[PDB]
Amino acid sequence: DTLPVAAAFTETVNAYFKGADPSKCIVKITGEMVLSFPAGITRHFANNPSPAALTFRVINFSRLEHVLPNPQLLCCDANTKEFWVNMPNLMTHLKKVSEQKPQATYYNVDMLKYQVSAQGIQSTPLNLAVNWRCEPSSTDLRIDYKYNTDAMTTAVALNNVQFLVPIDGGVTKLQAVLPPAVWNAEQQRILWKIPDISQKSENGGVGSLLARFQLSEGPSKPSPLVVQFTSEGSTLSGCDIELVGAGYRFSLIKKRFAAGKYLADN
Amino acid sequence: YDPFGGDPFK
Ligand SMILES: [Zn+2]
Ligand SMILES: [Zn+2]
Ligand SMILES: [Zn+2]
Ligand SMILES: [Zn+2]
Ligand SMILES: [Zn+2]
Ligand SMILES: [Zn+2]
């Protein structure tokens, strides 16, 4: 029989924006490549103590710096890299987890940890630019965002996007909010939630968040906007995976990315 | 964290 196997690329994009100046944008993208095996394998490997070699290739591998291969399972060319998995250590590992997690239907294993070479604001899926105008008893906030297709290999939506920003100065009331937000009085912060941002969004993916605050113990000190969002269907790196040799097929290759530490200063 | 958010095999 030929064994089903699964694969996931999961990337975190960290970004820091400074006012409206793109040159001052610091970006850092990291990722994990994970393989997954179905329970059956244990039995399967019991059948055969000399199984078919698990060998794969990463495509667009040159887009990665700082690559750490799983020390127990790997590592010992230009734009592709090939790997031969250590089968005795994998069989061992998978036996151990199966014995401790007997009701598990599948087992994930970390294969590769890496960085993705990122070139400034171009590598960033949600361009951001914040401006504060802080008056003694007043405060105006503006956030400008632009969905950026260039950052990702295939054009995919950004989901569950959150814009959180703390507001100093002793806020007493907010006016002129657009689109609607939520005020958290206890933490003294404002939160905008947008369910989806894509090319097929209300405005092409490009829009503004506005707010005005009245103060009693002003003026307020500008604070970092923190952003959250996830995404399924595409990498930032452009990596894919191929199986080389016989004995296994990919049942599924999951690609996805997410905001990690994603901020905007004044 | 599970990148498959469930069973990828069925
Ligand atoms: Zn079998
Ligand atoms: Zn090679
Ligand atoms: Zn182990
Ligand atoms: Zn992991
Ligand atoms: Zn690194
Ligand atoms: Zn949705």
Residue numbers in the entry:
A (entry chain A): 558 to 633, 639 to 828
B (entry chain B): 639 to 648
Q: Could you share sentences copied from the article?
A:
Src homology 3 (SH3)-domain growth factor receptor-bound 2-like (endophilin) interacting protein 1 (SGIP1) and its splicing variant, SGIP1α, are brain-specific homologs of FCHo1/FCHo2. The μHDs of SGIP1 and SGIP1α, which are identical to each other, are highly homologous to those of FCHo1/FCHo2. The μHD of SGIP1/SGIP1α also binds to the DPF motif-rich region of Eps1519.
We next crystallized the complex between the SGIP1 μHD and two short μHD-binding Eps15 fragments containing two DPF motifs derived from the high-affinity μHD-binding site, Eps15-640–649 and Eps15-645–654. In the two structures, the two DPF motifs are recognized by a continuous cleft on the μHD. The two DPF motifs in the two structures adopt type-I β-turn conformations, and each is stabilized by two sequence-specific intramotif interactions. This arrangement of the DPF motifs brings the hydrophobic side chains of all of the Pro and Phe residues of the two DPF motifs together on one side, allowing their extensive recognition by the continuous hydrophobic cleft of the μHD. Ala563 contacts the side chains of Phe in the N-terminal DPF motif and Pro in the C-terminal DPF motif, while Ala565 contacts the side chains of Pro and Phe in the N-terminal DPF motif. In the two structures, the two DPF motifs bind to the same recognition cleft on the μHD. However, the positions of the C-terminal DPF motif relative to the recognition cleft slightly differ between the two structures, probably due to differences in the lengths and the amino acid sequences of the linker region between the two DPF motifs. Nevertheless, the key interactions for DPF motif recognition by the μHD are essentially conserved in the two structures (see below).
